[PDB]
Design an enzyme around this catalytic site. Structure first.
Site, PDB file in Angstrom:
ATOM      1  N   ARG A  11       0.818  -1.194   0.000  1.00 18.43           N
ATOM      2  CA  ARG A  11       0.000   0.000   0.000  1.00 18.43           C
ATOM      3  C   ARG A  11       0.868   1.267   0.000  1.00 18.43           C
ATOM      4  O   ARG A  11       0.447   2.310  -0.496  1.00 18.43           O
ATOM      5  CB  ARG A  11      -0.988   0.049   1.171  1.00 18.43           C
ATOM      6  CG  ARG A  11      -1.656  -1.245   1.558  1.00 18.43           C
ATOM      7  CD  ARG A  11      -1.959  -2.190   0.404  1.00 18.43           C
ATOM      8  NE  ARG A  11      -3.024  -3.131   0.768  1.00 18.43           N
ATOM      9  CZ  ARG A  11      -3.134  -4.375   0.305  1.00 18.43           C
ATOM     10  NH1 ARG A  11      -2.259  -4.862  -0.559  1.00 18.43           N
ATOM     11  NH2 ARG A  11      -4.137  -5.138   0.704  1.00 18.43           N
ATOM     12  N   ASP A 460     -12.671  -4.539  16.254  1.00 16.57           N
ATOM     13  CA  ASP A 460     -12.330  -4.698  14.849  1.00 16.57           C
ATOM     14  C   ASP A 460     -12.585  -6.164  14.539  1.00 16.57           C
ATOM     15  O   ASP A 460     -12.213  -7.036  15.327  1.00 16.57           O
ATOM     16  CB  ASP A 460     -10.868  -4.345  14.589  1.00 16.57           C
ATOM     17  CG  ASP A 460     -10.572  -4.135  13.116  1.00 16.57           C
ATOM     18  OD1 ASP A 460     -11.055  -4.946  12.301  1.00 16.57           O
ATOM     19  OD2 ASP A 460      -9.865  -3.170  12.757  1.00 16.57           O
ATOM     20  N   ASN A 468      -0.207  -5.007   6.291  1.00 12.31           N
ATOM     21  CA  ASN A 468      -0.579  -4.144   7.400  1.00 12.31           C
ATOM     22  C   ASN A 468       0.648  -3.648   8.179  1.00 12.31           C
ATOM     23  O   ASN A 468       0.636  -2.545   8.722  1.00 12.31           O
ATOM     24  CB  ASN A 468      -1.506  -4.880   8.380  1.00 12.31           C
ATOM     25  CG  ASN A 468      -2.854  -5.295   7.769  1.00 12.31           C
ATOM     26  OD1 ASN A 468      -3.561  -6.124   8.334  1.00 12.31           O
ATOM     27  ND2 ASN A 468      -3.212  -4.718   6.651  1.00 12.31           N
ATOM     28  N   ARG A 471       2.396   0.002   8.187  1.00 12.53           N
ATOM     29  CA  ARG A 471       1.840   1.241   8.752  1.00 12.53           C
ATOM     30  C   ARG A 471       1.014   1.042  10.013  1.00 12.53           C
ATOM     31  O   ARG A 471       0.359   1.969  10.463  1.00 12.53           O
ATOM     32  CB  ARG A 471       0.990   1.974   7.730  1.00 12.53           C
ATOM     33  CG  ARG A 471      -0.284   1.212   7.343  1.00 12.53           C
ATOM     34  CD  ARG A 471      -1.192   2.015   6.361  1.00 12.53           C
ATOM     35  NE  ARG A 471      -2.486   1.361   6.207  1.00 12.53           N
ATOM     36  CZ  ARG A 471      -2.654   0.180   5.634  1.00 12.53           C
ATOM     37  NH1 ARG A 471      -1.615  -0.488   5.128  1.00 12.53           N
ATOM     38  NH2 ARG A 471      -3.866  -0.342   5.575  1.00 12.53           N
ATOM     39  N   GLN A 472       1.038  -0.160  10.572  1.00  9.85           N
ATOM     40  CA  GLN A 472       0.277  -0.494  11.770  1.00  9.85           C
ATOM     41  C   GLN A 472       1.293  -1.025  12.774  1.00  9.85           C
ATOM     42  O   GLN A 472       1.519  -2.220  12.882  1.00  9.85           O
ATOM     43  CB  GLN A 472      -0.803  -1.529  11.414  1.00  9.85           C
ATOM     44  CG  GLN A 472      -1.774  -0.994  10.388  1.00  9.85           C
ATOM     45  CD  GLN A 472      -2.859  -1.960   9.964  1.00  9.85           C
ATOM     46  OE1 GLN A 472      -3.189  -2.908  10.666  1.00  9.85           O
ATOM     47  NE2 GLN A 472      -3.432  -1.708   8.794  1.00  9.85           N
ATOM     48  N   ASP A 534     -12.276   2.566   7.365  1.00 12.07           N
ATOM     49  CA  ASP A 534     -11.813   2.643   5.993  1.00 12.07           C
ATOM     50  C   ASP A 534     -12.963   2.466   5.004  1.00 12.07           C
ATOM     51  O   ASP A 534     -12.759   2.046   3.869  1.00 12.07           O
ATOM     52  CB  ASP A 534     -10.769   1.566   5.750  1.00 12.07           C
ATOM     53  CG  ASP A 534     -11.315   0.170   5.953  1.00 12.07           C
ATOM     54  OD1 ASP A 534     -12.534  -0.003   6.184  1.00 12.07           O
ATOM     55  OD2 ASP A 534     -10.497  -0.767   5.886  1.00 12.07           O
ATOM     56  N   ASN A 535     -14.180   2.764   5.432  1.00 11.29           N
ATOM     57  CA  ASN A 535     -15.286   2.797   4.483  1.00 11.29           C
ATOM     58  C   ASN A 535     -16.383   3.778   4.927  1.00 11.29           C
ATOM     59  O   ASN A 535     -16.553   4.061   6.128  1.00 11.29           O
ATOM     60  CB  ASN A 535     -15.860   1.392   4.239  1.00 11.29           C
ATOM     61  CG  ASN A 535     -16.354   0.757   5.499  1.00 11.29           C
ATOM     62  OD1 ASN A 535     -17.541   0.820   5.803  1.00 11.29           O
ATOM     63  ND2 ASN A 535     -15.445   0.190   6.273  1.00 11.29           N
ATOM     64  N   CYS A 590     -22.160  -1.106 -21.872  1.00 11.36           N
ATOM     65  CA  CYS A 590     -21.832  -1.254 -23.282  1.00 11.36           C
ATOM     66  C   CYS A 590     -20.319  -1.081 -23.472  1.00 11.36           C
ATOM     67  O   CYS A 590     -19.698  -1.772 -24.283  1.00 11.36           O
ATOM     68  CB  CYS A 590     -22.656  -0.267 -24.164  1.00 11.36           C
ATOM     69  SG  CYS A 590     -22.235   1.501 -24.058  1.00 11.36           S
ATOM     70  N   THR A 591     -19.723  -0.170 -22.709  1.00 13.23           N
ATOM     71  CA  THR A 591     -18.305   0.094 -22.853  1.00 13.23           C
ATOM     72  C   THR A 591     -17.523  -1.113 -22.374  1.00 13.23           C
ATOM     73  O   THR A 591     -16.529  -1.486 -22.996  1.00 13.23           O
ATOM     74  CB  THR A 591     -17.881   1.338 -22.061  1.00 13.23           C
ATOM     75  OG1 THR A 591     -18.368   2.508 -22.725  1.00 13.23           O
ATOM     76  CG2 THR A 591     -16.355   1.431 -21.952  1.00 13.23           C
ATOM     77  N   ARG A 593     -18.597  -4.300 -22.176  1.00 16.32           N
ATOM     78  CA  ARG A 593     -18.932  -5.495 -22.931  1.00 16.32           C
ATOM     79  C   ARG A 593     -18.358  -5.459 -24.352  1.00 16.32           C
ATOM     80  O   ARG A 593     -17.944  -6.505 -24.869  1.00 16.32           O
ATOM     81  CB  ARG A 593     -20.457  -5.620 -22.981  1.00 16.32           C
ATOM     82  CG  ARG A 593     -21.032  -7.015 -23.208  1.00 16.32           C
ATOM     83  CD  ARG A 593     -22.558  -6.938 -23.445  1.00 16.32           C
ATOM     84  NE  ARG A 593     -22.862  -5.814 -24.339  1.00 16.32           N
ATOM     85  CZ  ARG A 593     -23.442  -4.666 -23.980  1.00 16.32           C
ATOM     86  NH1 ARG A 593     -23.860  -4.460 -22.732  1.00 16.32           N
ATOM     87  NH2 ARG A 593     -23.615  -3.719 -24.898  1.00 16.32           N
ATOM     88  N   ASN A 771     -25.868   1.258 -27.358  1.00 13.47           N
ATOM     89  CA  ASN A 771     -26.102   2.188 -26.261  1.00 13.47           C
ATOM     90  C   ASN A 771     -26.615   1.416 -25.061  1.00 13.47           C
ATOM     91  O   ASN A 771     -27.204   0.345 -25.211  1.00 13.47           O
ATOM     92  CB  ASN A 771     -27.125   3.265 -26.644  1.00 13.47           C
ATOM     93  CG  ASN A 771     -26.704   4.074 -27.863  1.00 13.47           C
ATOM     94  OD1 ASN A 771     -25.771   4.876 -27.798  1.00 13.47           O
ATOM     95  ND2 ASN A 771     -27.405   3.878 -28.976  1.00 13.47           N
ATOM     96  N   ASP A 772     -26.386   1.950 -23.869  1.00  8.90           N
ATOM     97  CA  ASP A 772     -26.996   1.379 -22.683  1.00  8.90           C
ATOM     98  C   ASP A 772     -28.509   1.502 -22.818  1.00  8.90           C
ATOM     99  O   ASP A 772     -29.226   0.500 -22.867  1.00  8.90           O
ATOM    100  CB  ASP A 772     -26.525   2.100 -21.418  1.00  8.90           C
ATOM    101  CG  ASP A 772     -25.175   1.613 -20.933  1.00  8.90           C
ATOM    102  OD1 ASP A 772     -24.750   0.512 -21.342  1.00  8.90           O
ATOM    103  OD2 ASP A 772     -24.549   2.330 -20.126  1.00  8.90           O
TER     104      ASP A 772
HETATM  105  O1  LIG Z   1      -7.514   1.917   7.367  1.00  6.88           O
HETATM  106  P1  LIG Z   1      -7.073   0.580   7.919  1.00  6.88           P
HETATM  107  O2  LIG Z   1      -7.497  -0.586   7.132  1.00  6.88           O
HETATM  108  O3  LIG Z   1      -5.607   0.570   8.246  1.00  6.88           O
HETATM  109  O4  LIG Z   1      -7.936   0.456   9.244  1.00  6.88           O
HETATM  110  C1  LIG Z   1      -9.352   0.317   9.168  1.00  6.88           C
HETATM  111  C2  LIG Z   1      -9.845  -0.764  10.105  1.00  6.88           C
HETATM  112  O5  LIG Z   1     -11.269  -0.608  10.329  1.00  6.88           O
HETATM  113  C3  LIG Z   1     -11.852  -1.883  10.446  1.00  6.88           C
HETATM  114  N1  LIG Z   1     -13.276  -1.801  10.134  1.00  6.88           N
HETATM  115  C4  LIG Z   1     -13.791  -1.513   8.922  1.00  6.88           C
HETATM  116  N2  LIG Z   1     -15.140  -1.520   8.963  1.00  6.88           N
HETATM  117  C5  LIG Z   1     -15.497  -1.844  10.221  1.00  6.88           C
HETATM  118  C6  LIG Z   1     -14.267  -2.030  10.990  1.00  6.88           C
HETATM  119  N3  LIG Z   1     -14.350  -2.349  12.299  1.00  6.88           N
HETATM  120  C7  LIG Z   1     -15.540  -2.506  12.910  1.00  6.88           C
HETATM  121  N4  LIG Z   1     -16.721  -2.352  12.260  1.00  6.88           N
HETATM  122  C8  LIG Z   1     -16.771  -2.029  10.944  1.00  6.88           C
HETATM  123  N5  LIG Z   1     -17.938  -1.868  10.285  1.00  6.88           N
HETATM  124  C9  LIG Z   1     -11.072  -2.780   9.492  1.00  6.88           C
HETATM  125  O6  LIG Z   1     -11.219  -4.155   9.823  1.00  6.88           O
HETATM  126  C10 LIG Z   1      -9.638  -2.203   9.590  1.00  6.88           C
HETATM  127  O7  LIG Z   1      -8.839  -2.960  10.502  1.00  6.88           O
END
Ligand SMILES: *O=P([O])([O])O[C][C]1O[C](N2[C]=NC3=C2N=[C]N=C3[N])[C]([O])[C]1[O]
EC number: 6.2.1.45
Lengths: 1006, 77, 77
Positions: A11, A460, A468, A471-472, A534-535, A590-591, A593, A771-772
């Protein structure tokens, strides 16, 4: 060497690139001083991978040094800081030797190093000498100091330094529709070029202007969002069609001045533009701190001392009289500012140390590589808003004095009582990855949750993978496979035993499916919540729970060198969800496929092929063979009936018996996808075909494809077969011939050479959507009859593949890279390697420890404001950073939107009607009229209507006497489940004027 | 009849022509015409303040030659 | 009574009859009457800039024999 380990540096590699890292791996770095600042810098640089790291600090470890030095323990007191730390730095990264410099009496030793960093343990006199030597010898020099909530850094990379890439952004690129003789380049339809005046571009595939394509760079003059000019192109010919432009980043030479020259004539980069007038004040201030130490036997001013603060002010004043130009003519010394700098001089604050630690580490990597734009050359910083209100937590010599504790130099700034409130905090940390690890480290250093009324909960659901580790920093190679939260919590207890027994490490995902775990009692007991995710989905979910339970939320994010922080304060600010981020781009079907023009398109295609060949196909066979109603359900419930049944028919008529059969299959798939399907496409649309308007069909962004002739010596053809064969074999439980070896070309060749490959015959009735929007995508009956009966296949099972981007032995990225590349050869798209393919198909987020540390630093300066329950929005700071530039910006949080009904103000995010008990409907309606002057008009629970003012008497009589739960049962026919303790109700209502008004929602507490 | 600058988080510099009475709304739409971002997704900060849709450049004491910053929330960590 | 040219993404050049005082709408509507593409879908550019519907060819110093660029707003493909 000349070799980079991708399994470790994955990463990070997407952030810096191979070349920059290769230069890093030839650089020797020296760090002078290993209090908190030095060890943060060293931690990040060692993680990043440099040739070697050397540390010099002969001073004895004292209890107070443990304020921010997370690798010191009380067992180490007495011993030298450098020695004790060396071994722990060394475990971060086995590729980076860490040595100790025993002495610095001979300055000539500095010649061993490419970058020298002097932290807060080095006097201003020694800094100047050392810088003079470095500068005149071509050694890169950086210095940094933190004092309480103040800090600075200084960069001097010498007389000659070359930046090779100023930003790390992908080069802009685009398709050209026209190039006029004056150089005017117009974009192909609604695409924006994105360039900037003075960028450079090269060209390819421009027809009619042939030497435009030779790699010459042209200087960009932007005309508008859709066109740029490159200067006359008459001499080159006449534009006909086609063309792609690619931005080229050119080298830039820069010069830095020495510390001596910059002391009297600094070039500032600002850390917070709302505070720009402070940079010059603090630049005088930090110098005055050194003059103070010269005058007082090396000592800094004493904590909260008035006598010394006046001296520091005098000192600064003297400097401004002598150098009127520093503050500017007529500009007065900011005495309050200088006073606090004195009061806090001995302070050692984790959030500030983390901020400069990440920033300075990143500058070290710039100095080693020419990647990114160096800070040039002084930057000052404060976080004075972090100070608590003195009414609540008074600061003075008594309250702030040392107590023989590891926390003494935090108490120096905040007072003993504030530090105790930090200990007694109860906090939830969501995520234990990169931000999570840094976060836990800061909290260990703060003593957060260590008090008899405090605790930390961290959760987690994920385990530790090799990439990992880069940076961890709480994880070690032996930890791979274990749970992040559990290992992290052990690691920080080792750093600070006050947390022993105080951290609850949980293994749960946070979201709607875990509310029986993280219930009312759990959330309500917290002081606040910290995200480390991270989401976007998890962030939104936590934000929604925090709003509901009225808890502060501290939010943060990174992407490479970019990062941000956000604060969310009950009854004060917008929440995370109040605002929208730009959404993911979507590629038209379409793009994908039929008409790809980018490697992204071929990678997605190949990723779907992979899914269908080795996952969906297998799951479908297993279902068909164990469910006798499978077909009947498909026919009625699947959109793609034909596809599912074809999948099963094919999966059972081939049936390989040996590995050789798997090779035959894969080679036949090559013919199907890269030869026959392409010939089928060219049959419906010949190259020279036209449309309903006289215009050439293959034009714009459609590239006319050419069929492939299989060539075992072409890397992509070969791997398509090798990976296809081995994957097939796995599905069918067949032993691979390359199961304990590498693949042998001549062995594959032998099998393929004796095959007979069926010729292409066109299908004259096939239609392909262009086209779509357009449509469309007796035979299905025959399909169903072709299927073998499960009776024949007792015990037969297929083994589906689970996509795993980070196992280099599994053939998955090998297959997608080769498959994408073949299709790229079909359509004359440049092939991509495995690294670039993994990035796109694996959706990997670029990440580095430097940005992670620094952003966690900012979060922890904001945390102080939660401990003081600050209610003035102006005191809080959302941060935005890009370490590449380097840029830092801050802004006051947005206020929560407010509303009004009957002249009564309310908060549209945070306010609600709390109601105790399973109240009767009639009682609720009356409560609202009498106590709120509101006429309830509509009441609903989720998606069902419980009450309306327009209901007839018959209905009203059935409902008015019902407790709310009973009313819900009456309407939904479902009872409330027992775990449920609250119910949210929405209402419409009229105010005392008879008008509909927006109001807060209702919470029923059962 | 003045010029201001918008720097993005990627280092890009955008030049705008505005009058001091223009609304934040006005400015965001000029950024859309130039960058393609829609106003709801734009986050602009200046001198410690985030710029809100109902106000004018004058309300934030934005002067000629001023530089605004267009910033983003990042999803990783 | 003048002529201008409009280039599309396929290399096609469309010839129009206009007066320098015609609005961009007019030109978009004229393109409809001759080519069949509807005004809502047309985006016209001249020298890098997008042309606003209310202004005239004269406001952009577009001259007889001038060449504009026609884009369709993007969707499918
Ligand atoms: O940005 P990194 O991947 O280094 O760390 C993110 C970390 O968050 C955890 N995570 C994502 N989504 C989660 C969650 N923990 C608990 N609940 C939810 N919904 C993921 O496993 C990473 O370790």
């Amino acid at each position: 060497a000349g070799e980079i380990d991708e399994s470790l540096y994955s990463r990070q590699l997407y952030v810096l690139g191979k070349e920059a890292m290769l230069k890093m791996q030839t650089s020797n770095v020296l760090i002078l001083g290993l209090k908190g600042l030095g060890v943060e810098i060293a931690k990040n640089v060692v993680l990043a991978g440099v040739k070697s790291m050397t540390v010099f600090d002969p001073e004895p470890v004292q209890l107070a040094d443990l304020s921010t030095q997370f690798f010191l323990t009380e067992k180490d007191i007495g011993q030298k800081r450098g020695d004790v730390t060396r071994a722990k730095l060394a475990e971060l990264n086995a590729y980076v030797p860490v040595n100790v410099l025993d002495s610095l009496d001979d300055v000539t030793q500095l010649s061993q190093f490419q970058v020298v960093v002097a932290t807060d343990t080095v006097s201003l006199e020694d800094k100047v000498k050392i810088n003079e030597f470095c500068h005149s010898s071509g050694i890169r020099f950086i210095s940094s100091e933190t004092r309480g909530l103040f800090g600075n850094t200084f960069v001097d990379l010498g007389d000659e330094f070359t930046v090779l890439d100023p930003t790390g952004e992908e080069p802009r690129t685009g398709m050209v529709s026209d190039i006029e003789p004056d150089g005017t380049v117009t974009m192909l339809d609604d695409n924006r070029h994105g360039l900037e005046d003075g960028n450079f571009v090269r060209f390819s595939e421009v027809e009619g202007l042939d030497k435009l394509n030779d790699g010459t760079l042209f200087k960009v003059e932007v005309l508008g969002p859709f066109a740029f000019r490159i200067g006359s192109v008459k001499e080159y010919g006449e534009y006909k069609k086609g063309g792609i432009f690619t931005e080229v980043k050119v080298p830039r030479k820069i010069s830095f001045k020495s510390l001596k020259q910059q002391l009297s004539n600094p070039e500032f980069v600002f850390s917070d533009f709302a505070k720009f007038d402070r940079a010059a004040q603090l630049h005088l201030g930090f110098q005055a701190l050194h003059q103070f130490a010269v005058r007082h036997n090396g000592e800094l001013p004493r904590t909260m001392n008035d006598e010394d603060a006046n001296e520091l002010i005098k000192l600064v004043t003297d400097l401004s009289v002598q150098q009127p130009e520093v503050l500017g003519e007529g500009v007065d010394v900011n005495e309050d500012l200088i006073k606090e700098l004195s009061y806090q001089a001995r302070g050692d604050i984790p959030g500030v140390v983390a901020f400069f630690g990440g920033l300075v580490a990143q500058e070290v990597l710039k100095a080693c590589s020419g990647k990114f734009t160096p800070l040039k050359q002084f930057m000052y910083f404060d976080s004075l808003e972090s100070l608590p209100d003195p009414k609540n937590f008074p600061r003075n010599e008594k309250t702030t004095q040392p107590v023989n504790s590891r926390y003494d130099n935090q108490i120096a700034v905040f007072g003993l009582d504030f530090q105790k409130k930090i200990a007694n905090s109860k906090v939830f940390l969501v995520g234990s990855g990169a931000i999570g690890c840094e976060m836990l480290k800061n909290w260990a250093l703060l003593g957060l949750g260590s008090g008899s009324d405090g605790y930390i909960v961290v959760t987690d659901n994920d385990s530790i993978e090799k990439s990992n580790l880069n940076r961890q920093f709480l994880f070690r190679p032996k930890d791979v496979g274990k749970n992040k939260s559990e290992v992290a919590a052990e690691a920080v207890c080792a750093m600070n035993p006050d947390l022993k027994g105080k951290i609850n490490a949980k293994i749960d995902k946070v979201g709607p499916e875990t509310e029986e775990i993280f219930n009312d009692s759990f959330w309500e007991s917290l002081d606040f919540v910290t995200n480390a995710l991270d989401n976007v989905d998890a962030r939104t979910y936590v934000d929604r729970r925090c709003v509901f339970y009225r808890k502060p939320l501290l939010e943060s994010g990174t992407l490479g060198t970019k990062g941000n922080t956000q604060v969310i304060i009950p009854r004060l600010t917008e929440s995370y969800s109040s605002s929208r981020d730009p959404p993911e781009k979507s590629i038209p079907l379409c793009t994908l496929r039929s008409f790809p023009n980018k490697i992204d398109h071929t990678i997605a295609w190949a990723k779907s092929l992979f899914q269908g060949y080795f996952t969906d196909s297998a799951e479908n066979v297993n279902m068909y063979l164990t469910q006798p109603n499978f077909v009947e359900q498909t026919l009625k419930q699947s959109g793609d009936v034909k596809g599912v049944l074809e999948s099963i028919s094919d999966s059972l008529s081939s049936k390989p018996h040996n590995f050789e059969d798997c090779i035959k299959w894969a080679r036949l798939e090559f013919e199907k996808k890269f030869n026959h399907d392409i010939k089928q496409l060219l049959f419906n649309f010949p190259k020279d075909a036209k449309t309903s308007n006289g215009e050439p069909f293959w034009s714009g962004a459609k590239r006319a494809p050419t069929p492939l002739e299989f060539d075992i010596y072409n890397n992509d053809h070969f791997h398509f077969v090798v990976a296809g064969a081995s994957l097939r074999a796995y599905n069918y439980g067949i032993k691979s011939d390359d199961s304990n070896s590498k693949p042998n070309v001549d062995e594959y060749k032998s099998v393929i050479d004796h095959m007979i490959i069926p010729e292409f015959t066109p299908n004259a009735n096939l239609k392909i959507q262009v086209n779509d929007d357009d449509p469309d995508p007796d035979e299905i009956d025959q399909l169903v009859s072709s299927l073998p009966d499960p009776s024949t296949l007792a015990g037969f099972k297929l083994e589906p593949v689970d996509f795993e981007k980070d196992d280099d032995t599994n053939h998955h990225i090998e297959f997608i890279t080769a498959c994408s590349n073949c299709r790229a050869q079909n359509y004359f798209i440049e092939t991509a390697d495995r690294q670039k393919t993994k990035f796109i198909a694996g959706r990997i987020i670029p990440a580095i420890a430097t940005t992670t540390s620094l952003v966690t630093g900012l979060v922890n300066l904001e945390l102080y404001k939660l401990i003081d329950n600050k209610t003035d929005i102006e005191q809080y700071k959302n941060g935005f950073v890009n370490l590449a530039l380097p840029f830092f910006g801050f802004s006051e949080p947005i206020a929560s939107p407010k509303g009004e009904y009957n002249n009564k103000k309310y908060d549209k995010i945070w306010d609600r009607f709390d109601i105790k008990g399973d109240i009767k409907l009639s009682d609720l309606i009356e409560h609202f009229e009498k106590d709120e002057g509101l006429e309830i008009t509509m009441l609903s629970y989720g998606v069902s209507l419980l009450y309306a003012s327009f209901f007839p008497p018959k209905k009203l009589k059935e409902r008015l006497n019902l407790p709310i739960t009973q009313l819900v049962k009456l309407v939904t026919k479902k009872d409330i489940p027992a775990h449920v303790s609250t119910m949210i109700l929405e209402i419409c209502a009229d105010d005392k004027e008879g008008e509909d008004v927006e109001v807060p929602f209702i919470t029923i507490h059962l | 009849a003045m010029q201001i600058f918008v720097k993005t988080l990627t280092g890009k510099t955008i030049t705008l022509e505005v009058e001091s009475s223009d609304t934040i709304d006005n400015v965001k739409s000029k950024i859309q015409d130039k960058e393609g971002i829609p106003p709801d997704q734009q986050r602009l900060i200046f001198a410690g303040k985030q710029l809100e849709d109902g106000r004018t450049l004058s309300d934030y004491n934005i002067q000629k030659e001023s530089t605004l910053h267009l910033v983003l929330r990042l999803r990783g960590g």
